[PDB]
Amino acid sequence: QIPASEQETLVRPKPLLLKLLKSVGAQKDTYTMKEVLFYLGQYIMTKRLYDHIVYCSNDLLGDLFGVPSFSVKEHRKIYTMIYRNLVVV
Ligand SMILES: CC[C@@H](CS(=O)(=O)C(C)(C)C)N1C(=O)[C@H](CC(=O)O)O[C@H](c2cccc(Cl)c2)[C@H]1c1ccc(Cl)cc1
Numbered sequence: 001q002i003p004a005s006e007q008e009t010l011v012r013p014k015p016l017l018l019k020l021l022k023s024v025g026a027q028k029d030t031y032t033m034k035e036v037l038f039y040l041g042q043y044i045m046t047k048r049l050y051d052h053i054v055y056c057s058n059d060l061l062g063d064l065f066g067v068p069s070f071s072v073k074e075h076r077k078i079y080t081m082i083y084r085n086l087v088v089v
Contacts, residue, residue, distance in 0.1 A: 002075055007034040010089040016064055017085035030089055036082065 011031055013021060021031070024046065025039045040061075044050050049059055050072065057068035065081040072078075 002079070006079070007032065007037070009033040011036060011086040012089050013086045016060070017082075020060060020064060033079075033082075036086070040082070 009032065011033060012029065013031065013036070017036075018027070020043060021027070021036070021039045024043045025035070031039075044054055044061070047059065049056050049061060052072050053069050054061075054072060055069045056062035056065065062068055064085055066084075067081070070077065070081070
């Protein structure tokens with residue numbers, strides 16, 4: 001029960017989120033939430049942090065989100081953790 005519109009939001013990552021995104025995607029100043037979620041998704045799968053829990057205490061992603069692990073099924077929490085690392089444009 002998250003709206004579809006949320007993936008349209010325009011955002012400006014803070015430096016550490018930007019560092020992580022640069023490892024998987026082109027470097028722009030502005031991203032859609034859709035893009036951010038995809039890049040983070042690819043980052044996680046590429047680095048195999050996920051086998052419904054993502055484990056990230058041995059990874060920069062852990063520092064980014066402030067948790068050692070999280071559930072992929074809890075989307076509102078994920079959006080919340082993402083939002084602390086960006087500015088809405
Ligand atoms: C790395 C985990 C990826 C995998 S996936 O969708 O890309 C695929 C099934 C294609 C392999 N992921 C999920 O597995 C879960 C699947 C689900 O529980 O519905 O969806 C995650 C998702 C999608 C959209 C928004 C949010 Cl906040 C999270 C989504 C996700 C979780 C965390 C982050 Cl940071 C980004 C995307």
